[PDB]
Design a protein around this ligand. Sequence first.
Ligand code: HEM
Length: 367
Amino acid sequence: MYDWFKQMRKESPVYYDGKVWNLFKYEDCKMVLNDHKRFSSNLTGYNDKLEMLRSGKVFFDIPTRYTMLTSDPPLHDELRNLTADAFNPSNLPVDFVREVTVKLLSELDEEFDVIESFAIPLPILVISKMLGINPDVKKVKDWSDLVALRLGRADEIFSIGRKYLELISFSKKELDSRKGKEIVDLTGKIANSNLSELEKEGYFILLMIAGNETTTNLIGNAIEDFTLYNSWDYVREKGALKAVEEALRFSPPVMRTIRVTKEKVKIRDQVIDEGELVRVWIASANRDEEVFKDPDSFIPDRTPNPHLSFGSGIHLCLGAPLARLEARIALEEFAKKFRVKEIVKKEKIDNEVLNGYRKLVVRVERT
Ligand code: HEM
């Protein structure tokens, strides 16, 4: 789609596709993301029925409609503050991340799929630790995909089934079991907060799912990019701090996000009415030639590197510090342990929003 993006950036940067407005230019995307007053995230009615929720009124709905991701301040800020400290660099479980990474890599043969054997389990084990739940990896992965793989698919991520009910019941079981028992981990903090049961479930589910899906894509995308563009020696000698940022820019785990206008606005020469949906194409913004010279070139030491892969503004990814830490440790440990001979087989995830490999088989040599 990068060709489409390039074609759209030059001839129709602010484009209406018949249902929603699409932004392909970096500056337009950054502006929209930072301007939360005019471009709301209140896309699921969370802010509107907050009063109803806190009153004690119970109605059947899917928890995922009630998370900080789709809320405007002050509610948004109040929600984020509940767990924000736990995601600050100084509080991340650094040793645990490294320990799990090394053990996962110890179980590998000269040829393996880095997605199922490494990229998938690492984030799941780490977020489970922070949540304080005992990680049934396969189960958590299945639920994560159940929710994540519905993104882009019109109104399905809010549709419920047997597997979704299983997820909601698990969230309720975990939360209820920690209510009145502990507030040391994320589950306990949510459970003992003053939010409605439905909000607690959504908050818990958000942290568990957003906590691994995109990080798996980042690690897999980076292993692919570093191999293809021969960045491994650079990472072994300099570390992966800048390389991870280029991987984020070049292969964004999340291709786009969305907002809804709260008032009539004008972007470039286009007038957009109140209540209209606006797709912010992070992927296209990251390849905007204006902002990124040699946009299609993978330059691991690109500096500075202001990509929008984690968003921008008040919704800037709460897990950004954690994701970068996991990716940095995963890739540096991988580089130290293996010499990638070749990418044997690769298969992309079929989704419009999530960008990554569902299978990436590599042949390596010890050292
Ligand atoms: C690993 C690659 C990741 C990427 C590329 C990514 C990207 C993003 C983006 C773009 C947003 C904002 C979406 C919007 O503005 O509508 C967001 C929000 C959020 N992310 Fe991530 N994320 C990643 C990992 C994680 C992880 C690991 C966690 C938790 C472990 C996490 C927790 C959250 C939360 C809670 C929000 C909501 C923030 C709020 O609305 O203020 N993310 N992420």
